[PDB]
Amino acid sequence: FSNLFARDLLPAKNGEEQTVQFLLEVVDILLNYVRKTFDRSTKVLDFHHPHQLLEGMEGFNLELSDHPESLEQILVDCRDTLKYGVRTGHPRFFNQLSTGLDIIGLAGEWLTSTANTNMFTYEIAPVFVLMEQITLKKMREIVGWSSKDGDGIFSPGGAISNMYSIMAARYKYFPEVKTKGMAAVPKLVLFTSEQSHYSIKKAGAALGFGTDNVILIKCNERGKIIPADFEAKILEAKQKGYVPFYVNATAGTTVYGAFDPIQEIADICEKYNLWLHVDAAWGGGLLMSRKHRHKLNGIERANSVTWNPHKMMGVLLQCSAILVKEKGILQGCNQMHASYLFQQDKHYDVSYDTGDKAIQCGRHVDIFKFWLMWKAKGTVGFENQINKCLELAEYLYAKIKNREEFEMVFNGEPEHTNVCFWYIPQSDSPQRREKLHKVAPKIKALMMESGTTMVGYQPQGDKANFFRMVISNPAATQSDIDFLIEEIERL
Amino acid sequence: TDFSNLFARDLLPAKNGEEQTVQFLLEVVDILLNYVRKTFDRSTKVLDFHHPHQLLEGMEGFNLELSDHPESLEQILVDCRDTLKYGVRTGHPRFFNQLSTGLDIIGLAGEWLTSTANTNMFTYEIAPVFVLMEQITLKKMREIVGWSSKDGDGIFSPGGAISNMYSIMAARYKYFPEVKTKGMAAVPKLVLFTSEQSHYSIKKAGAALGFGTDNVILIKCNERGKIIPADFEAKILEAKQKGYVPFYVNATAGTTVYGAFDPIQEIADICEKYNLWLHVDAAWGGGLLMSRKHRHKLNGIERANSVTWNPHKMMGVLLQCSAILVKEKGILQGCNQMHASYLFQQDKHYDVSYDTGDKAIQCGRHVDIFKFWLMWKAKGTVGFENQINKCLELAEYLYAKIKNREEFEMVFNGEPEHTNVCFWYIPQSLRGVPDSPQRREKLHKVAPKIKALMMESGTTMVGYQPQGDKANFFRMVISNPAATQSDIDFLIEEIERLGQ
Numbered sequence: 001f002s003n004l005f006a007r008d009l010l011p012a013k014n015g016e017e018q019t020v021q022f023l024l025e026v027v028d029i030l031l032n033y034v035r036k037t038f039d040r041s042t043k044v045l046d047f048h049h050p051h052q053l054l055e056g057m058e059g060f061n062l063e064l065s066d067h068p069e070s071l072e073q074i075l076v077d078c079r080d081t082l083k084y085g086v087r088t089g090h091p092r093f094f095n096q097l098s099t100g101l102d103i104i105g106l107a108g109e110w111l112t113s114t115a116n117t118n119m120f121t122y123e124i125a126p127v128f129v130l131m132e133q134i135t136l137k138k139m140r141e142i143v144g145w146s147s148k149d150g151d152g153i154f155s156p157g158g159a160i161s162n163m164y165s166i167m168a169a170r171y172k173y174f175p176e177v178k179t180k181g182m183a184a185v186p187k188l189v190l191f192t193s194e195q196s197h198y199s200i201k202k203a204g205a206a207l208g209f210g211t212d213n214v215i216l217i218k219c220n221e222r223g224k225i226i227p228a229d230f231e232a233k234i235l236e237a238k239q240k241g242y243v244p245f246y247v248n249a250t251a252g253t254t255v256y257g258a259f260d261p262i263q264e265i266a267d268i269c270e271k272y273n274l275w276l277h278v279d280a281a282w283g284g285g286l287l288m289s290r291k292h293r294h295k296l297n298g299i300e301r302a303n304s305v306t307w308n309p310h311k312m313m314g315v316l317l318q319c320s321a322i323l324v325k326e327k328g329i330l331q332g333c334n335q336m337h338a339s340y341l342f343q344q345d346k347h348y349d350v351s352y353d354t355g356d357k358a359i360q361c362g363r364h365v366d367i368f369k370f371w372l373m374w375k376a377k378g379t380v381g382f383e384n385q386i387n388k389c390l391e392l393a394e395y396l397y398a399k400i401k402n403r404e405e406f407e408m409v410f411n412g413e414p415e416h417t418n419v420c421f422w423y424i425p426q427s428d429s430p431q432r433r434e435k436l437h438k439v440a441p442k443i444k445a446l447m448m449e450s451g452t453t454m455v456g457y458q459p460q461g462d463k464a465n466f467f468r469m470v471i472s473n474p475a476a477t478q479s480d481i482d483f484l485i486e487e488i489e490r491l
Numbered sequence: 492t493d494f495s496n497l498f499a500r501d502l503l504p505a506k507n508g509e510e511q512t513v514q515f516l517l518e519v520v521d522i523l524l525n526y527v528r529k530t531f532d533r534s535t536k537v538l539d540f541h542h543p544h545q546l547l548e549g550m551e552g553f554n555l556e557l558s559d560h561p562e563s564l565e566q567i568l569v570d571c572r573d574t575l576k577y578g579v580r581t582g583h584p585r586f587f588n589q590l591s592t593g594l595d596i597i598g599l600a601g602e603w604l605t606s607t608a609n610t611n612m613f614t615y616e617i618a619p620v621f622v623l624m625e626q627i628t629l630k631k632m633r634e635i636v637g638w639s640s641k642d643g644d645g646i647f648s649p650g651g652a653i654s655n656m657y658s659i660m661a662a663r664y665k666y667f668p669e670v671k672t673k674g675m676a677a678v679p680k681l682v683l684f685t686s687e688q689s690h691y692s693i694k695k696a697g698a699a700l701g702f703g704t705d706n707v708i709l710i711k712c713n714e715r716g717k718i719i720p721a722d723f724e725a726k727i728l729e730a731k732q733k734g735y736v737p738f739y740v741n742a743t744a745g746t747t748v749y750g751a752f753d754p755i756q757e758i759a760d761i762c763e764k765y766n767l768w769l770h771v772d773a774a775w776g777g778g779l780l781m782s783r784k785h786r787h788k789l790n791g792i793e794r795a796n797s798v799t800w801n802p803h804k805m806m807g808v809l810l811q812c813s814a815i816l817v818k819e820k821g822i823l824q825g826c827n828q829m830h831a832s833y834l835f836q837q838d839k840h841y842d843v844s845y846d847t848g849d850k851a852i853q854c855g856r857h858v859d860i861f862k863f864w865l866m867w868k869a870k871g872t873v874g875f876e877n878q879i880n881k882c883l884e885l886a887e888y889l890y891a892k893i894k895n896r897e898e899f900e901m902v903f904n905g906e907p908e909h910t911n912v913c914f915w916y917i918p919q920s921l922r923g924v925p926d927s928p929q930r931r932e933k934l935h936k937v938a939p940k941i942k943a944l945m946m947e948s949g950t951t952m953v954g955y956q957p958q959g960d961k962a963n964f965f966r967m968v969i970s971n972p973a974a975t976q977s978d979i980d981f982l983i984e985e986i987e988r989l990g991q
C-alpha cells in the first residue's frame with residue numbers, strides 16, 4: 001500500500017479488492033482504538049500544545065500538498081490522528097456533557113456514512129425520512145404531548161434547535177416579520193434563565209431581536225428560575241410598551257444541572273400568552289427514566305422542546321431535535337414557497353420533504369445511529385443506563401458533601417449528574433475567592449499533563465472557578481468516580 | 492459468530508464483552524463492504540423504489556417501529572442490511588439526481604475514523620488535531636480563492652445554506668454592529684440583493700435574520716442565467732431613493748439549475764462604488780477553483796468579502812462539508828461571541844486563541860474536517876483537479892451529444908459553464924410542433940412521466956424542474972468520479988427509451 005494511491009481504489013476499474021483491503025486496514029486501526037477506549041491503562045489524552053503539532057510530531061505532517069500521499073501514509077495519518085486526539089469514550093473522560101462511545105451508535109454512524117445521502121427529500125433518503133418521523137413521534141409521546149398535533153426536525157446541534165424554537169414562536173405571533181422584517185412589528189422580548197445556555201442570547205442576536213431584548217430571569221440558590229421574577233419581567237416589558245412572547249425554561253442547566261419549574265412557568269405563559277420552549281438538551285435523557293422524568297413535569301404543556309440524544313442518551317455527535325407541539329409552524333415559518341405546489345408531478349408524496357420547514361437546505365443523516373440504538377437497547381436500555389449515571393452522581397455528591405478538602409458551590413441536592421464543587425487548598429473572604437479561583441485551573445493543567453482524567457471547571461456570577469463533574473458515560477463506574485475524587489485531592 | 496441471543500447491553504462497556512464487540516463491528520463492516528462493492532456495479536439498482544406505506548407497513552421483516560424492549564444483535568444486523576437495501580445508491584455511476592453524489596473511499600474511511608473519535612469542534616482541549624487541520628485547510632482555501640496567506644478567516648458549517656446565513660450576519664455586523672444588542676428595528680430598512688436564479692438560502696436567511704423577504708431584492712438574469720449588472724446598479728439606486736440602506740449582494744458562482752456564473756468583476760465594481768459587502772456563493776462552483784482550466788469562471792472572487800464553498804459538492808466530500816470564508820479576520824468572532832464561561836475559559840493551560848467555538852452560530856459542532864483533509868492528503872490538489880476536469884469534460888460530451896439532436900431541446904442558448912446540462916426530451920408528437928402555450932403545457936408532463944418510469948426500473952435518476960415560464964426540464968449534473976461516458980450514453984438512451 002506504500003506504492004498504492006487513492007486514484008487506484010474504486011471508482012477506478014478493477015479496484016474492488018484493494019478498496020476492501022484498504023477499508024479493513026482502516027477498520028483494524030479503529031478496532032484497536034475502540035478496544036483501548038475501554039482500557040483504563042490508556043491515557044484519556046496525550047496532551048500537546050498547538051505549536052508542538054504545527055511544527056510537527058515525529059512523522060506527522062498536517063500540511064497539504066499538490067501531490068497525493070500513498071495509501072500506507074494515509075493509514076499512518078489515521079493512526080496518528082487517533083494517537084493525538086482525546087479518548088471521549090474513556091471511562092475517565094468527564095470533561096463534557098457528551099461522553100462515552102456507544103458501539104451500536106458507532107455502527108450506526110459507519111452505516112450512515114456508507115449511505116451518504118441528504119435528509120431533505122424522501123426521494124434520496126426514503127428510509128431515513130421515515131425513521132425520523134417515527135422517532136420524532138415517540139419523542140413527542142414521551143414528552144407527554146397528545147397525538148392530535150405535533151411536529152419536529154433534527155438539527156445540527158441544540159443551539160440551532162433553540163434558534164428554531166424562537167423562529168417558530170415569532171412566526172406564530174408575528175408572521176409579518178418573515179416578509180416585512182423585525183422593524184414591521186413592536187419590540188419583541190424573550191426570557192431565559194440567568195443560568196440558561198448562551199444559545200438563547202446568540203439566536204436573539206442572529207434573528208434580529210438584539211441581545212438587549214433577551215431578558216435574564218433571576219435564579220434561586222439551586223440555580224432554578226424564580227417564577228415571580230419571570231412574571232415581574234413580563235409586566236415590566238408590557239409597561240414599557242414592549243411585546244413579551246417567548247420563554248426558554250431550562251430542563252437541566254449546563255453547569256448546576258438545575259431544572260426550571262416548568263409548571264409554574266407554563267401557568268404564567270398561559271396567563272400572559274407566551275410561547276413556552278423547554279431546553280431539555282441536557283435534561284431530556286431523564287424523560288426516558290420513570291424514576292427521574294418528574295424533574296421535567298410541565299413539559300407536556302410546552303410549545304416546543306430542544307432535546308439532545310447526543311448528551312445523556314449517548315448517541316454519537318450530533319443528534320438534536322426540536323419538537324414543536326403545533327404542526328405547520330416550522331413549515332409556515334421556513335417555506336420560501338407555500339403548499340403542495342411541488343405536486344402533482346412528483347412520483348412520491350412531497351409532504352415528506354423537509355427542505356421547506358428547515359433553515360438548512362442540505363441536511364446530514366443523524367437519525368439512523370439514534371434509531372439503531374433505540375432498536376438495540378429499547379426504552380428500557382436507555383432507562384437503566386441514565387439511572388446508573390444519576391446513581392453514580394448521587395454517590396459522588398454524598399462522598400464529598402462534607403469532605404474537608406471539598407466545598408459545595410450551592411446549597412441543594414443535584415437534580416442531574418452535575419456535581420459542582422471546589423477543591424480547597426487549606427481554608428468566605430474576597431481575598432480567599434482570589435486564592436480559590438486559581439486552584440481548579442492548576443489541577444486541570446496537571447490533569448491534562450498526566451492524562452489520568454478530564455474534568456471541566458468554570459466560574460459563575462461572583463463564584464470562583466469551580467469543578468463541575470458531570471456523568472453521561474455508561475463506561476464510568478463507582479471506582480472511576482473514586483479515582484477522580486482521589487485524583488483531585490492528590491493534585 | 493452467533494448473535495441470536497446477544498444484546499447491545501452485553502457489548503463494551505460491559506466487562507468481558509470485548510471479543511463480541513469486535514465480532515459484531517466486523518459483521519456490520521462486512522455488510523457495508525458488500526454494499527460498497529455493489530455501489531460501483533452498474534447492474535445494481537440506483538434505488539429500489541417504495542412508496543412510504545410499503546416501508547411503514549413493514550417490508551418482510553423490516554420493522555421501523557420503536558419499542559420498550561431490545562432486539563438481539565442478529566436482528567440489528569438484519570435491520571442494517573435492510574436499511575441499505577431500501578436506500579439510494581448515491582455513489583452509483585448512474586445517479587445524477589443531485590449536486591452531491593459519489594462515494595469517495597478516502598472520505599468514507601475519514602468519516603468512520605471521525606465517528607470513532609466522536610468529538611466536538613468547539614475547543615482545542617477536546618479536538619486538538621481537528622482544530623489545527625481545520626486552520627490549515629481554511630488557510631489553503633483562502634489562498635486558492637486569491638486572498639492573502641496571513642489575513643483571513645472562516646469556519647466549517649452544517650451546510651452551505653448556513654454558510655450563506657453567516658455571510659449576511661457578518662455583512663450586517665460589519666456595517667451595523669448596533670443590531671447585535673439593539674435589534675434590526677434600531678437601524679434603517681436594510682436591503683440585500685441576489686440573483687433571480689440564486690439559491691433560496693438567501694431569502695430564508697433574510698426571513699430568519701429579521702430583514703424580511705420583501706427586503707431580499709431579486710436581480711434580473713440574462714438568457715444565460717447571469718445577473719445583468721445594470722439591473723443591480725438600478726436596484727441599489729431604487730432602495731437608496733426610498734431611504735433604504737443597501738449593504739450586501741450575493742453573487743452566485745455556479746447556480747444549481749443552469750450552472751451559470753455571475754459576473755463577479757462587474758458586480759464587485761458596483762459594490763466598491765456604493766460601499767456594499769460582496770459575498771460569493773461558490774457552494775456549487777467552488778470545486779472549479781481547483782481546476783487551472785476552469786477557475787476563470789470565478790475571476791473576481793479575490794475581491795469578495797466572503798465565500799461559501801461546499802467541498803461536499805464538486806470535490807466529492809461526504810455530506811456535510813461546507814465552509815464560509817471571510818476576508819477580514821475578527822468579523823466572525825465579533826458578530827457571534829457570547830463569552831460563555833463554561834466553554835471558552837480564558838485562564839486555560841494552553842493558548843485559548845485556538846478555541847474557535849465562539850465565532851460560530853453553533854455550540855456543539857460535528858467534525859467535518861477530517862474526511863476532507865484526508866481526501867486532500869490522498870488526492871493532492873492534482874487529484875481534485877483531475878476529478879473536477881473529468882466531470883466537466885463529461886458535461887461537455889453530454890451537451891454536444893444532445894445539442895443538435897431532434898429528440899431533444901436545449902433550455903437556454905449557451906455553453907454550459909458548470910456540469911449542469913439543461914434540456915427537454917421531445918416526444919415524436921411534439922416534433923416539430925411550433926412553440927405555443929399549448930405545446931408548453933403538453934411538454935411540462937413529459938419530464939415527470941419519464942422520471943416516474945425511471946423510478947420503476949431504478950436504472951438511473953435525474954432531476955427535472957421548471958423555471959419561470961419554461962415547462963419542466965431535465966437538469967443533468969455530474970459530480971460523481973464514478974460516472975463515465977457510457978453512463979452518459981445510457982442516460983440519453985434511457986430518457987429516449989422511456990420517452991417513447
Ligand SMILES: O=C(O)c1cc(=O)cc(C(=O)O)o1
Nearest residue numbers: 095096097098456833854855
Ligand atoms: O457537547 C458537549 O459535550 C457540551 C456542550 C455544552 O454546551 C457544554 C459542555 C460543557 O460545559 O462541558 O459540553
Ligand SMILES: O=C(O)c1cc(=O)cc(C(=O)O)o1
Nearest residue numbers: 361362588589590591747954
Ligand atoms: O447537496 C445536494 O445534493 C443538493 C443541494 C441543493 O441545494 C440542490 C440540489 C439539486 O437540485 O440537485 O442538490
